[PDB]
Write a protein that binds this ligand. Structure first.
Ligand SMILES: O=C(O)CNC(=O)C(=O)O
Ligand SMILES: [Mg+2]
Ligand code: NI
Ligand SMILES: [Zn+2]
Length: 331
């Protein structure tokens, strides 16, 4: 078995190997990359996402989210308070202001320490989940807006035609902006490209050990666990690396820098934070190996998790027993 310890692997594809996306995901899996739940892909030196980022200030963040924490430093939940719209230009200025800027620090390790120590006492503002793309239309390789769709994957594998579309999303982050512990909708893969700015630190649990995270989460968020048998789908819970280590949960961490891709694999729980002003683009995708995970994915039916239009068909085809209950939670 390749990568039995479930370490996060880092890949350096050549320009030749960067031509066929599907083939390269399959190659990574042949090397055991999926065991970690997360991989990093450094693009070949000849590749570029776009020519410059000079003209992005006019993108609108229609609903910036202020991330307000409750709990203790290592075990907290966060809720999103909607703020008034602002442009990327305005957001970047806000990120760099004395109230929100990255503090002085020695290295990534020191900054991580300051994150887990102090995150709960601040409420950073995240421009998340903005439909759109920053890839140049002429970028042919690993262009997240030109991937084969999940609907076409399901059709190719299962022979059923379904409605739905699959498009990327932009994330504008600042110091301490946080993504809570989650897997993807229907335990899909995700791919995330850090277009510009400061880094993003990631924590991941190997898919083979995801249920150990869930069990600990039920213990740490006992009211939430009573409200819903899949409350991590709400994407509100944070658990620090110190807490995970105390409770023997296997995990890994890695920091993503501008110009790098991360791939999350089916049922790879991940969480993390941004180091300072940045812009990422991410999209879900599927492979044939995903199908069995989609059939087994937990679902939130309490009403909180509320997701896209396109998830309907996935639940309807892959999880027909669950469909009625799940849809009641959507409606
Ligand atoms: O970048 C973020 O805020 C969150 N991204 C992801 O969870 C992902 O790409 O799967
Ligand atoms: Mg613009
Ligand atoms: Ni994710
Ligand atoms: Zn729920």
């Amino acid at each position: 078995a390749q990568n039995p310890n479930c370490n996060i692997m880092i890949f350096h594809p050549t320009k030749e190997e960067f031509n066929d996306f599907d083939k390269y995901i399959a190659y990574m899996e042949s090397q055991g990359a999926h065991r970690a739940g997360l991989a990093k892909i450094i693009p070949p030196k000849e590749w570029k996402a776009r020519e410059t980022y000079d003209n992005i200030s006019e993108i609108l963040i229609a609903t910036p989210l202020q991330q307000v924490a409750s709990g203790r430093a290592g075990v907290f939940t966060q809720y999103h308070k909607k703020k008034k719209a602002m442009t990327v230009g305005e957001y970047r200025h806000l990120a760099n202001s004395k109230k929100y800027q990255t503090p002085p620090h020695q290295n990534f390790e020191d900054l991580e320490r300051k994150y887990w120590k102090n995150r709960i006492y601040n409420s950073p503002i995240y421009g998340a989940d903005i439909s759109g793309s920053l890839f140049d239309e002429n970028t042919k390789q690993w262009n997240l807006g030109h991937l084969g769709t999940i609907q076409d994957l399901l059709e190719k594998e299962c022979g059923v035609v379904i409605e739905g579309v699959n498009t990327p999303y932009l994330y504008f982050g600042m110091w301490k902006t946080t993504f809570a512990w989650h897997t993807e909708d229907m335990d899909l893969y995700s791919i995330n490209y850090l277009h510009l700015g400061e880094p993003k630190t990631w924590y991941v649990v190997p898919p083979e050990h995801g249920q150990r995270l869930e069990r600990l989460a039920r213990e740490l968020f006992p009211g939430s666990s009573r409200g819903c048998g899949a409350f991590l789908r709400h994407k509100v819970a944070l658990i620090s690396p110190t807490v995970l280590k105390e409770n023997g949960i296997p995990f890994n961490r890695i920091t993503q820098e501008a110009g790098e891709f991360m791939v999350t694999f089916p049922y790879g729980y991940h969480a993390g934070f941004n180091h300072g002003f940045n812009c990422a683009e991410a999209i879900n995708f599927a492979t044939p190996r995903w199908i069995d995970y989609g059939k087994m994915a937990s679902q939130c039916s309490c009403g909180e998790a509320r997701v896209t239009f396109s998830m309907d068909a996935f639940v309807r085809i892959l999880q027909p027993e669950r469909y009625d209950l799940w849809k009641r939670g959507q409606d």
